[PDB]
Amino acid sequence: ANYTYWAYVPFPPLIRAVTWMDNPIEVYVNDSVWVPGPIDDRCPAKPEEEGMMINISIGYRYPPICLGRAPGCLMPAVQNWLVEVPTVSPISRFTYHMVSGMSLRPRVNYLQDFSYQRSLKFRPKGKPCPKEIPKESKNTEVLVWEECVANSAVILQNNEFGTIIDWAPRGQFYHNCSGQTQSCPSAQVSPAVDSDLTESLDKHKHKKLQSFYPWEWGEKGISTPRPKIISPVSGPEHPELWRLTVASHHIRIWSGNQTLETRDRKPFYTVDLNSSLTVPLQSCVKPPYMLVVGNIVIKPDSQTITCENCRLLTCIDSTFNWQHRILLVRAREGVWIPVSMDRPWEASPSIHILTEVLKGV
Amino acid sequence: ANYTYWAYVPFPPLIRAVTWMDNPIEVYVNDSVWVPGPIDDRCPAKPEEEGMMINISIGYRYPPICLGRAPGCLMPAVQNWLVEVPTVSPISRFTYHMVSGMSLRPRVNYLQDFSYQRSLKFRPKGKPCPKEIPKESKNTEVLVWEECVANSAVILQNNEFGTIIDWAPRGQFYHNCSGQTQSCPSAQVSPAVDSDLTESLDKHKHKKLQSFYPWEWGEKGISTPRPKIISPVSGPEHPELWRLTVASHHIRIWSGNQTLETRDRKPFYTVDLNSSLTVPLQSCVKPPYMLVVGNIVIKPDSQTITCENCRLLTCIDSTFNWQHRILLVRAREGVWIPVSMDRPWEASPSIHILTEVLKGV
Amino acid sequence: ANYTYWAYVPFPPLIRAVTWMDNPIEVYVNDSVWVPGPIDDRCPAKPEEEGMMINISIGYRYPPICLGRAPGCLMPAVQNWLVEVPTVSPISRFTYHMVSGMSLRPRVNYLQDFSYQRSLKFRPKGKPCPKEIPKESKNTEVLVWEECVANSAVILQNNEFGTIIDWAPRGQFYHNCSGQTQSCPSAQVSPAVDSDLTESLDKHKHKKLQSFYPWEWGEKGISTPRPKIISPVSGPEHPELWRLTVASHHIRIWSGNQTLETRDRKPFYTVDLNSSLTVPLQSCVKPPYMLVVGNIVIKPDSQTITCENCRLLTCIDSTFNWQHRILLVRAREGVWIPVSMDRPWEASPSIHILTEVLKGV
Amino acid sequence: FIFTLIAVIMGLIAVTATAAVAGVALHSSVQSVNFVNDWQKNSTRLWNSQSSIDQKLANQINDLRQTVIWMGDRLMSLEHRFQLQCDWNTSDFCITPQIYNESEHHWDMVRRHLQGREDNLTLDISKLKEQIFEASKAHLNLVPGTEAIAGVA
Amino acid sequence: FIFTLIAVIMGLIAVTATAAVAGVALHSSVQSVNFVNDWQKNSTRLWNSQSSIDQKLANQINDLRQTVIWMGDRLMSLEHRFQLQCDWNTSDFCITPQIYNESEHHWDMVRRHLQGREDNLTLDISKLKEQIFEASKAHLNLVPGTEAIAGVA
Amino acid sequence: FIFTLIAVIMGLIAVTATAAVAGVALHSSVQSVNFVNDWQKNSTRLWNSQSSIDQKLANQINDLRQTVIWMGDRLMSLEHRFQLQCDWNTSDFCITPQIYNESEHHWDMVRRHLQGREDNLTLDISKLKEQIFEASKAHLNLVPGTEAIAGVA
């Protein structure tokens, strides 16, 4: 007849979403010149298997880690890290070295003059991000990434999929308008945008900012995003997702300065930045971790992740198309499943061996 | 007949004491507002099993970790952490935010003006506890716990059960009498006592200190006990035991100030502290760790732990009675034991199966 | 007949070299007064087995960790750690406390005035080594080892066996001749040499340096070697090898000073150091780690390690002879080997049991 | 916990993608042992074929929390597997002698467990493990039943 | 290494407390196999029933030293158990074929081992494991003795 | 992962040194099962005899990376061993039913593997494990062949 028994599959070919409750996973970048470790310049062990299609329909207990432009996924945008070297010249304020890389976009306050949505909750222990300019800026060419704690965190997601905040700093140009009149603009300016990473890669890029007020950069610190979930659960920081986002486009290396001239008998400040240098990157996860790329749909009312014709990858490079989302996944642990046999469960073949021996006689 | 064989029990229902040579274990507190992590607000998974009685008779190799008032156990007492904010007013010196919590009592020098017994041995690495008061005290309402190394360690136990020292600071009020005359008191004053955590919880509490000399607080630092054993063995720090002791009573939240007036044409300094706020806490260990609560008796000449009618718990709350001691325990690893059978050892039932088959014929 | 089958040996009696790609291993020293942890004052568990002879012939994938004077092995030399306490006296500059210990010799620049070969590549994170002298030098007698990052790394090996650099500081006496004339010597002076650790151990030792220019010590920091490989592979730091080298000889404890007098109406500076104190140390690795001591020959063209009549040890003490090299080894993981039987592979003895039963009938 | 699957004949991506097709039917309903075995064989082969942990990647790990938690889960699974009673004819995975009770565990709980859920409608793994451990004693299963012995005799 | 035993039918507290009563007599003298099995069955069931490591508690661990040491002891125990030879009828725990020798190991050493001591009067676990490993060879125990074969024949 | 082998009768040094003599001939050519068993027995005994992790040494570990990597390798090895099919008469190590094929694996690859090499002339462990896993199914090996059954009959 038919006999159904519970079976344990220790290494099932299933996958499960990496969640915000997981501790950070390893993302390996192939260029240690511009990106901190861990480093691996090797191609995927099975390059021929990258991009294989799959339909995904899974559940989850904690909000999955997804990147891209979709509900439940963290949208990407360009982040700028600026190194400033003061200059003794009376007509120059600073010399600049800027890096533009695709990272996690903070939410914006549409009512509050298009600033960043900010949260002061659960401030982590760590070195605060610097507020002054180090006079002795040695090793200017070599970028040093140092983790620091911002004055306030930026909100990356504050909806029914969860609340994610990032206590890493976000750098922007602004004006010291505390003591000035109402004519001082209070809006922050991003020196670079998304198009600076994709279009006309080999062509010269220039950015010019002009104002009657000095240009200040803040918040300072060569520090990369460390997002964490604070609601409906509290999870650990994830300083590795930016590594995945930064490889999806070239990073752009700028130099420049801020100069001072006279206009209408008043000080006039101009920030000039140039770049003809872009660096392509490759960021990879390794087994048991993988990435599911495509139209990831996260439904939190039933805690379901679905995708039709997604692709399984392990590496992200500059040819990534941000019409797709990325879901971090890991090989599923052992599972329990009923299985149907045509005979009762047997511990050993001893009865079978005895029957064969008797039949031989 | 009878055949006795050695057997290995991998998961025996035994327990063994957690010793000072163990590395720190996890204690989970349910209020992250006032106590650092790890955090868990859940009730015990089996609340109906808490308090089950048991007789205990075990041995040990290293001094067990016990809290309470008994030989071999660390006695508890109130510890006060004070946050001082300087005030620009000429008649006020500081504003105060104090937290009183049950923690590990240091030994006292009965001859040396009832001060703390102190040891300078095995000074650990780390940030020294601050000696000055930071002028910019932001986020004053939110208490920030900083781990710091005191100028000298306090001795918690210096007897035949072992020598335990704690390099975390202990805060007390005192006077700077280095340049004063002999009339300057040298005794340290504790702003709070044990009764401040237990009696009249909902009633207003006030503390007033008055002197012709300014009141100083030391040693500073919002830092919790990190006791370690240095004799007869050297073990790692245990910054988690204070978490168990702090949940046994409410913590009391004080606010206050120090003010200056004129008395007999001389400066007169008054510290005022007031509190109408207490917070109840729950601290829990998780399997395989548990707590044995009751009349723990530690005999070091034979290294024996005994208790009659102890209770097995996993959580400590404000209803804890300090007539009982707490012994940290963990589920015992596999053990080896003789067992008696009525037949010789057999590898497989093959002989039994053959006998049954022959009998069937 | 003969039947050969693959077999897996989980715990083979083989050994494999510890490589520079391994993470640091534990080396235990028996004197916590002068050497940081981990500490173990016990003799080897099997003292009678220390020194057993063995022939070694193994391969490797990454450059093995070897100490001694041979190709592929890091040569040892004396390193000096100096603590200087400023003195308020007008005729004295500093009081000195020096520790001399056998550690990893840096390569020398034969062309560049016998300085150290230095590399600026892959600067690690950490507190920079101090450039000034702390005025408040408390706990002068107790030496405190602080890890610090030097201004530049010293090269220990730059040949076909790999490139090994060390970002830990190396201290020496020198003159600050930036503003002086060409008569100011630019050569660094080592206050101690190899013989100071070996010959006439119980006899008084003195070192006198005299110059018309002040004696400076650099680079400062009580910091021990942390070598790492940067080519042809990049590996983690190994701050434990110096522990093995330092036990091979007594350490020597010096005390001294720098004094100023008048000579030809000019300031004359004399550094006087004296020592009658040597400390013997014992550094041990523990199973599964061991040391192969003797004529280790590393051939990198085939990646082979060979030694005839080497000795297997676990501890190094002051009787070590530096004519031999030390190769760190570990017990080998399971291996796969063909093995020959005289019968086919059998899952169970069931056929044998049935045959015996039939023969009994 | 970290490996470079270069020498193997099937990477993790190929195993997952090629198994998903049969995983659909596995999610739909109870399948035979041959179906499940064919569905899991490549995954089991891949996870029984890694040579050693890749040091180049392993030695760069800074935060060990995720690695240690993954290792703890693997060790727990190995401990539980070591005490499971399994049918002799299937060595890739363990078929226990616990009979599937459709009334107690309707298929939706199993499908939710396969999907990786842990809500109140999912199969209760701890309770099932308790039942299997209680029912899989060697003194209840190792000796073949009277029917088999009579059939042999 | 960290679990929330909510779904189980018996927590660690209940297992320990209810087993201590029989543990008294276990400390007193050698007991039968049935006695020991009854004494340990709750604990073995509990430690064969946890579902997965509780992530909420696990991801907050700062100092991993104690967890790594506990996992190392568990892994060493699992490695040793994998090579032990056990009587077929007892699956909850392993009964080796090593005969208890009262003259070599008087009961006080066993009682001290059960109490969790490691002094000079306690049973020497390493020496006992050496004896058991040397005496539990498959070529010495797997084949039934001549007496059993003659009895069958 | 850290032990004080004081109670044992043979430390790691003695095991390695006394086994090297036969390890020479083991590197030279294929040996018999008795030879290999004699050569590995003391190492297996030593690694089946440690009592517990020495806390005095374990609690001082600052960098857990090497320990965690070693533990991961041990856990992976144990996981692979749990699924190996082994000849019943050898319990110290696992003799698989995979026949040595000299043409595919010439002895130099085996010697290089025994030497601890991983170059392009060394035995490919992952491919060998794949072949062994595929060939060691319970349904292909557990039932004795027709020749043995006929010989019994």
Ligand SMILES: *[C@@H]1O[C@H](CO)[C@@H](O[C@@H]2O[C@H](CO)[C@@H](O[C@@H]3O[C@H](CO[C@H]4O[C@H](CO)[C@@H](O)[C@H](O)[C@@H]4O)[C@@H](O)[C@H](O[C@H]4O[C@H](CO)[C@@H](O)[C@H](O)[C@@H]4O)[C@@H]3O)[C@H](O)[C@H]2NC(C)=O)[C@H](O)[C@H]1NC(C)=O
């Ligand atoms: C980390 O990993 C990333 C991702 O794989 C690597 O990025 C690749 O880097 C290579 C080498 O720099 C890139 O190849 C270059 O791409 C550019 C564009 O090529 C296109 O356009 C030209 C137009 O003439 C076509 O011929 C060509 O087919 C492409 O359509 C060019 O800058 C380069 O070509 C020029 O330079 C090379 C020398 O560099 C000359 O040989 C050529 O003749 C020509 O003059 C070159 O083709 C590649 O595109 C990158 N990939 C991605 C996906 O962005 C990183 O290199 C790697 N980093 C490290 C440190 O390993």
Ligand SMILES: *[C@@H]1O[C@H](CO)[C@@H](O[C@@H]2O[C@H](CO)[C@@H](O[C@@H]3O[C@H](CO[C@H]4O[C@H](CO)[C@@H](O)[C@H](O)[C@@H]4O)[C@@H](O)[C@H](O[C@H]4O[C@H](CO)[C@@H](O)[C@H](O)[C@@H]4O)[C@@H]3O)[C@H](O)[C@H]2NC(C)=O)[C@H](O)[C@H]1NC(C)=O
């Ligand atoms: C962490 O875990 C701890 C330990 O479990 C929790 O502490 C408990 O907190 C609750 C809620 O604050 C406490 O309950 C309160 O206790 C007080 C005393 O109640 C006694 O006296 C009144 C007298 O009228 C009796 O009616 C009552 O039966 C008790 O004998 C009172 O302050 C509270 O009652 C008043 O307030 C509540 C609203 O808070 C009203 O509903 C009531 O009607 C009344 O006005 C209340 O009963 C409880 O005692 C604490 N337990 C312990 C053991 O201390 C922490 O809350 C928890 N923390 C977090 C953040 O989760």
Ligand SMILES: *[C@@H]1O[C@H](CO)[C@@H](O[C@@H]2O[C@H](CO)[C@@H](O[C@@H]3O[C@H](CO[C@H]4O[C@H](CO)[C@@H](O)[C@H](O)[C@@H]4O)[C@@H](O)[C@H](O[C@H]4O[C@H](CO)[C@@H](O)[C@H](O)[C@@H]4O)[C@@H]3O)[C@H](O)[C@H]2NC(C)=O)[C@H](O)[C@H]1NC(C)=O
């Ligand atoms: C860490 O581990 C190291 C290495 O094992 C230990 O170092 C040993 O320390 C002991 C004790 O300090 C040393 O023993 C001493 O050696 C010296 C030289 O002895 C030689 O010369 C004398 C000449 O008279 C001969 O008699 C003798 O046989 C040797 O040939 C002497 O300084 C000592 O002898 C004098 O002092 C002792 C008291 O200390 C008196 O009893 C003696 O009578 C005599 O007056 C003594 O013998 C030993 O040599 C060291 N070993 C090595 C290999 O260097 C460390 O002690 C240990 N550290 C800790 C903290 O445990």
Ligand SMILES: *[C@@H]1O[C@H](CO[C@@H]2O[C@@H](C)[C@@H](O)[C@@H](O)[C@@H]2O)[C@@H](O[C@@H]2O[C@H](CO)[C@@H](O)[C@H](O)[C@H]2NC(C)=O)[C@H](O)[C@H]1NC(C)=O
């Ligand atoms: C059971 O053990 C006894 C006693 O063991 C001896 O004493 C122990 C404390 C320990 O040191 C063991 O190693 C010792 O062997 C054994 O009786 C001994 O047998 C040997 C060999 O025949 C003989 O030389 C000794 O004199 C005996 N010692 C006595 C009688 O006290 C006995 O062989 C063991 N095995 C059994 C009974 O099977």
Ligand SMILES: *[C@@H]1O[C@H](CO[C@@H]2O[C@@H](C)[C@@H](O)[C@@H](O)[C@@H]2O)[C@@H](O[C@@H]2O[C@H](CO)[C@@H](O)[C@H](O)[C@H]2NC(C)=O)[C@H](O)[C@H]1NC(C)=O
């Ligand atoms: C034993 O091995 C031989 C040779 O294996 C081939 O060469 C190895 C170096 C490696 O590349 C293997 O994958 C190869 O298969 C096998 O003989 C081969 O058999 C196949 C199939 O019948 C045949 O097409 C090839 O020509 C043979 N190659 C030769 C003779 O060199 C052989 O099957 C293996 N097994 C045995 C004998 O049982």
Ligand SMILES: *[C@@H]1O[C@H](CO)[C@@H](O[C@@H]2O[C@H](CO)[C@@H](O)[C@H](O)[C@H]2NC(C)=O)[C@H](O)[C@H]1NC(C)=O
């Ligand atoms: C994912 O599922 C979709 C939907 O069932 C599959 O698309 C089907 O593909 C078959 C074969 O080419 C077509 O006959 C059907 O018409 C398709 N259905 C639809 C609705 O378009 C798809 O193949 C699956 N993808 C993977 C990778 O398994």
Ligand SMILES: *[C@@H]1O[C@H](CO)[C@@H](O[C@@H]2O[C@H](CO)[C@@H](O)[C@H](O)[C@H]2NC(C)=O)[C@H](O)[C@H]1NC(C)=O
């Ligand atoms: C921005 O422009 C400056 C000045 O033109 C560029 O710096 C020059 O780089 C070239 C090429 O290496 C050198 O020959 C010149 O000497 C440099 N001049 C100065 C003033 O530094 C700089 O590279 C540009 N920034 C980019 C491309 O990011």
Ligand SMILES: *[C@@H]1O[C@H](CO)[C@@H](O[C@@H]2O[C@H](CO)[C@@H](O)[C@H](O)[C@H]2NC(C)=O)[C@H](O)[C@H]1NC(C)=O
């Ligand atoms: C711990 O041991 C004590 C002492 O043996 C037990 O107390 C006994 O309880 C029984 C049953 O109620 C009484 O008949 C005895 O008179 C008690 N003895 C004494 C000396 O008072 C107690 O029950 C044990 N506790 C547990 C939890 O097992």
Ligand SMILES: *[C@@H]1O[C@H](CO)[C@@H](O[C@@H]2O[C@H](CO)[C@@H](O)[C@H](O)[C@H]2NC(C)=O)[C@H](O)[C@H]1NC(C)=O
């Ligand atoms: C100590 O007393 C002060 C002063 O009365 C309390 O602060 C008052 O708190 C109430 C209630 O929130 C406010 O309405 C008043 O404005 C506060 N006054 C001042 C001067 O700040 C304080 O809460 C008490 N400290 C405790 C309860 O810990």
Ligand SMILES: *[C@@H]1O[C@H](CO)[C@@H](O[C@@H]2O[C@H](CO)[C@@H](O)[C@H](O)[C@H]2NC(C)=O)[C@H](O)[C@H]1NC(C)=O
């Ligand atoms: C290591 O190998 C050498 C070289 O074969 C061995 O030295 C031989 O020792 C034997 C026995 O004493 C002598 O008969 C030979 O003449 C020696 N050969 C040479 C070339 O000197 C040595 O014994 C081996 N050592 C170990 C520890 O196994």
Ligand SMILES: *[C@@H]1O[C@H](CO)[C@@H](O[C@@H]2O[C@H](CO)[C@@H](O)[C@H](O)[C@H]2NC(C)=O)[C@H](O)[C@H]1NC(C)=O
């Ligand atoms: C270097 O010499 C000084 C001066 O002689 C030594 O210091 C003396 O030590 C002895 C013995 O403890 C004391 O009695 C003297 O009072 C010390 N003198 C001074 C001026 O401090 C010092 O020990 C020597 N350094 C060593 C041995 O390392």
Ligand SMILES: *[C@@H]1O[C@H](CO)[C@@H](O[C@@H]2O[C@H](CO)[C@@H](O)[C@H](O)[C@H]2NC(C)=O)[C@H](O)[C@H]1NC(C)=O
């Ligand atoms: C498991 O992997 C095997 C290969 O080892 C797959 O078998 C292949 O299946 C495809 C599609 O049917 C055939 O075209 C190939 O010829 C097969 N290769 C062989 C037999 O070597 C198999 O489909 C996989 N099974 C799964 C994923 O369930």
Ligand SMILES: *[C@@H]1O[C@H](CO)[C@@H](O[C@@H]2O[C@H](CO)[C@@H](O)[C@H](O)[C@H]2NC(C)=O)[C@H](O)[C@H]1NC(C)=O
């Ligand atoms: C394994 O260890 C045993 C001891 O347990 C070794 O046996 C000894 O061998 C030497 C040399 O032949 C003899 O003199 C001793 O009498 C033996 N001791 C005994 C039998 O107790 C054996 O050589 C080792 N085997 C190896 C390393 O392969």
Ligand SMILES: *[C@@H]1O[C@H](CO)[C@@H](O)[C@H](O)[C@H]1NC(C)=O
């Ligand atoms: C060396 O001397 C110069 C010239 O006086 C001075 O500027 C400098 O600070 C001194 N020290 C160092 C470390 O260069």
